[PDB]
Scaffold this active site. Structure first.
Site, PDB file in Angstrom:
ATOM      1  N   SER A  32       7.160  23.960 100.057  1.00 30.83           N
ATOM      2  CA  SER A  32       7.864  24.145 101.331  1.00 30.83           C
ATOM      3  C   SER A  32       6.825  24.336 102.461  1.00 30.83           C
ATOM      4  O   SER A  32       5.759  24.900 102.266  1.00 30.83           O
ATOM      5  CB  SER A  32       8.775  25.359 101.412  1.00 30.83           C
ATOM      6  OG  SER A  32       9.593  25.559 100.252  1.00 30.83           O
ATOM      7  N   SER A  56       6.112  24.413  93.871  1.00 33.70           N
ATOM      8  CA  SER A  56       7.118  25.310  94.453  1.00 33.70           C
ATOM      9  C   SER A  56       8.419  24.589  94.648  1.00 33.70           C
ATOM     10  O   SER A  56       9.017  24.062  93.661  1.00 33.70           O
ATOM     11  CB  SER A  56       6.501  25.863  95.751  1.00 33.70           C
ATOM     12  OG  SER A  56       7.230  27.002  96.184  1.00 33.70           O
ATOM     13  N   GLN A  57       8.931  24.419  95.878  1.00 36.75           N
ATOM     14  CA  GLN A  57      10.147  23.669  96.071  1.00 36.75           C
ATOM     15  C   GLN A  57      10.017  22.229  95.504  1.00 36.75           C
ATOM     16  O   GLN A  57      11.028  21.692  95.054  1.00 36.75           O
ATOM     17  CB  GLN A  57      10.545  23.577  97.567  1.00 36.75           C
ATOM     18  CG  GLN A  57      11.866  22.958  97.789  1.00 36.75           C
ATOM     19  CD  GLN A  57      12.403  22.704  99.170  1.00 36.75           C
ATOM     20  OE1 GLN A  57      13.412  22.162  99.472  1.00 36.75           O
ATOM     21  NE2 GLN A  57      11.648  23.291 100.125  1.00 36.75           N
ATOM     22  N   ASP A  79       3.093  35.207  89.414  1.00 35.74           N
ATOM     23  CA  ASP A  79       3.808  34.382  90.404  1.00 35.74           C
ATOM     24  C   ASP A  79       5.307  34.648  90.363  1.00 35.74           C
ATOM     25  O   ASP A  79       6.042  34.202  89.475  1.00 35.74           O
ATOM     26  CB  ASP A  79       3.480  32.904  90.177  1.00 35.74           C
ATOM     27  CG  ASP A  79       4.196  32.040  91.183  1.00 35.74           C
ATOM     28  OD1 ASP A  79       5.004  32.432  92.047  1.00 35.74           O
ATOM     29  OD2 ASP A  79       3.991  30.802  91.118  1.00 35.74           O
ATOM     30  N   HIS A  88       0.928  32.714  93.597  1.00 32.62           N
ATOM     31  CA  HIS A  88       1.623  31.455  93.897  1.00 32.62           C
ATOM     32  C   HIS A  88       0.775  30.452  94.688  1.00 32.62           C
ATOM     33  O   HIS A  88       1.013  29.245  94.736  1.00 32.62           O
ATOM     34  CB  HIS A  88       2.881  31.716  94.705  1.00 32.62           C
ATOM     35  CG  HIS A  88       3.736  30.501  94.893  1.00 32.62           C
ATOM     36  ND1 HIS A  88       4.447  29.925  93.842  1.00 32.62           N
ATOM     37  CD2 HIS A  88       3.990  29.742  95.961  1.00 32.62           C
ATOM     38  CE1 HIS A  88       5.095  28.879  94.339  1.00 32.62           C
ATOM     39  NE2 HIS A  88       4.848  28.716  95.647  1.00 32.62           N
TER      40      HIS A  88
END
Length: 195
Positions: free
Chosen positions: A26, A104-105, A159, A172
């Protein structure tokens, strides 16, 4: 470079043996963001520049922060964008091996897209790397409908997205070394075995 469009801008004649489709985190830059380029660099070195097409997920995937709070971890439009690219890889270059990745996303987006993918096209994805996978817990460190032995999740201890949260902590943000080393080498292993 943080924007690669090797497949959408690619011509048939020039089809690569290997096509890598990657979705960024993101609010990241380009269509490759922070990990994508490191992974491409390494793949280029394994297969040569002419041997691998690097294709980030751009277009409708806007990588907004809000969209992590949707059901699947990303928007419908983003999943249909990655679906179409695997679909273009399938069609423009029918004899190449696909590989995939996401952070991530983008990890959420890789998962959903591949779960959704026609089995036939999915069969062609040799290896998939997930970094800071936001549905790690929800999906038991799998991608739904995709074999564990072609999946490699990087989910660092501490994370929190890996353990049902959306809090972004220092681990992360630490997938850098992974994206330069073990993550492409897994994708290189997987391609070479089948090719």
């Amino acid at each position: 470079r943080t924007t690669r469009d090797d497949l959408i801008n690619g011509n048939s004649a020039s089809c690569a043996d290997v096509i890598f489709i990657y979705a960024r985190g993101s609010t990241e830059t380009g269509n490759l963001g922070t990990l994508g380029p490191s992974i491409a660099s390494n793949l280029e070195s394994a297969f040569g520049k002419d041997g691998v097409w690097i294709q980030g997920v751009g277009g409708a995937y806007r990588a907004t922060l809000g969209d992590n709070a949707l059901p699947r971890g990303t928007s419908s439009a983003a999943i249909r964008e990655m679906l179409g690219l695997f679909q273009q890889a399938n069609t423009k270059c029918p004899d190449a091996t696909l590989i995939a990745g996401g952070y991530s996303q983008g990890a959420a987006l890789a998962a959903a897209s591949i779960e959704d993918l026609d089995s036939a096209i999915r069969d062609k994805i040799a290896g998939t790397v997930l970094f800071g996978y936001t549905k790690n817990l929800q999906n038991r460190g799998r991608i739904p409908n995709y074999p564990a032995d072609r999946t490699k999740v990087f989910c660092k201890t501490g994370d929190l997205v890996c353990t049902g949260s959306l809090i972004v902590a220092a681990p992360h943000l630490a997938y850098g070394p992974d994206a330069r080393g073990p993550a492409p080498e897994f994708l290189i292993e997987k391609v070479r075995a089948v090719r």
